[PDB]
């Protein structure tokens, strides 16, 4: 049986760690809401 606890406000934080790339991906979405790579 699941419960929720607060973890913060929702705010943009200037000089946060900038990271990760920007890939363009061909994907399909099935009826179970799972994405897959088209190839």
């Amino acid at each position: 049986d699941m419960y929720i606890e607060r973890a913060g406000d929702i705010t943009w934080e200037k000089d946060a760690e900038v990271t990760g790339n920007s890939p363009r991906l061909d994907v399909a979405l099935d009826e179970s809401g799972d994405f897959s790579l088209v190839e």
Binding site: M2, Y3, E5, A7, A16, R24, L25, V27, L29, G33
Partner: protein, 156 residues
């Protein structure tokens, strides 16, 4: 229960100790998370009970106490912030320029950041602080690394 706007952890005791299964957003009295986190189960906010109101397994979204409220969209150009809330660890912004999921039905923002599954439901923000979608439904690429979609609902 606590209805203050903000980001929350989704906890269960049904397993060993207390386990973080996901994350969500409280806005305008409605709690927003991903369907695979709760499976549409009711939630507790202290002594308050939260009852599912809307949900769609294909969108992998669900809302509690009212209709989906978050209607902000990636502009297609700007960097975003993932407000990650990992299990056992403090909330932490991570700035990134999102990639693209190309599908037969149109193009979706994507973020290339790998976090634990229990981070699912963490929101993604624009520069004005508005939630443009939730993290936790995506794909594993040639490498072995994870890429989440930017998943956004419709506000009626």
């Amino acid at each position: 229960g606590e209805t203050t706007d903000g980001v929350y952890r989704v906890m269960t005791r049904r397993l060993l100790g207390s386990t973080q299964v996901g994350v969500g957003v409280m806005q305008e009295g409605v709690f927003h998370t991903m369907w695979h986190v709760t499976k549409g189960a009711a939630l507790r906010s202290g002594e308050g009970r939260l009852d599912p109101y809307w949900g769609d397994v294909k969108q992998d979204l669900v809302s509690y106490c009212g209709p989906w409220k978050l209607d902000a969209a990636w502009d297609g150009l700007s960097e975003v912030q993932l407000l990650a809330v990992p299990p056992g660890e403090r909330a932490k912004n991570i700035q990134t320029l999102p990639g693209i999921f190309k599908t037969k039905d149109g193009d979706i923002g994507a973020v290339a950041l790998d976090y634990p599954a229990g981070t699912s439901g963490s929101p993604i923000l624009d520069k004005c602080g508005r939630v443009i979608g939730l993290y936790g439904n995506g794909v594993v690429i040639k490498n072995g690394s994870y890429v989440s979609a930017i998943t956004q609902g419709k506000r009626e």
